[PDB]
Amino acid sequence: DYDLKFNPDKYISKEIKINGKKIKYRAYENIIYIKNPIDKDYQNMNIYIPEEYFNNLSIGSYNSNNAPIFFPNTVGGYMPGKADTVGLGRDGKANSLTYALSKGYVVAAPGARGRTLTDDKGNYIGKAPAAIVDLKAAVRYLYLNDEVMPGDANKIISNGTSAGGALSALLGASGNSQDYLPYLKEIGAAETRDDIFAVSAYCPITNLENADSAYEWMYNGVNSYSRMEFTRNTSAQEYNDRSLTRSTVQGNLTNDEINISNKLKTLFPIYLNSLKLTDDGGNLLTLDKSGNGSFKTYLSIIIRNSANRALREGKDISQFKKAFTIENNKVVAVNLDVYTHIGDRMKSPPAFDSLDASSGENNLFGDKKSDSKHFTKFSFDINNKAAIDYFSIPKMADKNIIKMMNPMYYIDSNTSTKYWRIRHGAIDKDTSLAIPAILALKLKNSGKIVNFAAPWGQGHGGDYDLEELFNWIDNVVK
Ligand SMILES: [Mg+2]
């Protein structure tokens, strides 16, 4: 019943000054991008278009029929995320949408449902796969209105951080997969298409069902933790903006936690070898049963490359030199095991599928009537065996919904999105560096152009490098 055609006449004239330039744009705010919305506060989208594109003017190489479409989402924690607005970040500098507008991009910024959202009757409406369905549905809206809306729908660049990086990556990996259509039909998405031109993903929290073994492979033996306390009800912004003041919990892993981490580590080589990932040379990246082999040597080179860039920039590597072989003031070798034992660990095992089903990712895999579920055989079987011994009974997420949240099952040599920029910080312990690396390898092995880097001294977060990011987008757009 909600009409889906874009009205170029229904806008507000807005402006913003970054340091001295006046960026004028036309704002089309809170468009319902779906004919039958279930939650209109979240399933709407803001579209910002530079004012030049209504006066037959150019911004750089870009014009009103030319401009790439910058597609940022605001999701963190797999929580509901509202459409982003044009303004400044906490640093006081231009945020990503303001940056995009100054460079001549059209900005379409969708909101999306998330894991705590309910309907009027209390049923959950934002458990998996709602958020990926909302992002697909907004893309389809962009394609349906391409001919009347300024810009080029064939050049959509997705952006996200953390959980929202996972969705941006998912959006690039599953373009037009049939799995999502019954959900798109149900909410009346436009019947166009949802493949995108390029993905940018900061610290994606993906591959959820394999992120527990990878995290213990990396961090086994680090038995004292410290982390910010996140709860069921932590908002998106607090998951993604680590510059906000939060209280911190710290302690030592219990003996059972250590046995669980021992067992989880044991399980990662079976999984990693199953992927048959090859590096640049066609050399298979594998792991022995002891957890060593070429894949670990591959990871250590990412760190070596990170620390050597830091050196060239005069940054401090001091705290981590004990893991480094340094000769003529270049790092030539990195003992990855030593490197990962340097800080305190962050999450406790199992880091994603907790035994009491209380993680945020547990909460993502609830359904209309269940607030959380398991999604790994490992955590489910522990609880299932305990219930049988008792004569609580655990629930396991639907296999097809676990699939729909994981870009790994969709990346092919035929994946249509060519360009991918992936960042995971060298001191980011919200997930294993093994996980974004595995995503990056899978895309390279499938013939896609991948720009992957672990920036030194960088924890969880996104958009800390907007100048470099839009250099990449400009280059990728050609
Ligand atoms: Mg257009």
| Listed residue (420, 473, 423, 470) closest to 448, CA to CA | 420
Cα 173 to chain center, whole Å? Answer: 12
Q: How far is the CA of 62 from the centre of ligand 1 (A)?
A: 12
Q: Which residues does 205 contact at the CB level (< 8 Å), separation at least 6? A: 162, 163, 165, 166, 211, 361, 430, 431
Helix (H, G, I), strand (E, B) or coil at 239: helix
Rounded CA separation 423/408 (Å): 17
Quick check: 439 and 200 in contact, CB under 8 A? Answer: no
Spacing of C-alpha 148 from chain mean position: 31
Q: What is the dihedral of CA 122, 364, 253, 389, to 10 degrees?
A: 70
Number of domains in the chain: 1
Distance (Å) from CA 148 to ligand 1 centroid: 6
Distance 150 CA to ligand 1 centre (A): 4
CA of 153 relative to ligand 1 center, distance in Å: 6
Q: Which domain covers residue 187, as residue numbers?
A: 1-478
342 vs 251: CA distance, rounded Å: 16
Question: Ligand 1 centre and the CA of 42: distance in Å?
Answer: 24
Tell me, in angstroms, the distance from the centre of ligand 1 to residue 194's CA: 15
Experimental method: X-ray
151 annotated ligand binder: yes
Residue found under tokens 């014009």:
63
Separation of 143 CA from ligand 1 center, angstroms? 8
> Is there a binding annotation on residue 146?
yes
Ligand 1 center to residue 446 CA distance, Å? 30
The DSSP letter of residue 48 is: E
CA 419–ligand 1 middle distance (angstroms) = 21
Integer angstrom CA distances of residue 269 from 217, 276, 377, 414: 9, 11, 16, 27
Distance 474 CA to ligand 1 centre (A): 18
The residues near 352 (Cβ < 8 Å, ≥ 6 apart) are 208, 211, 212, 215, 359, 361, 362, 376
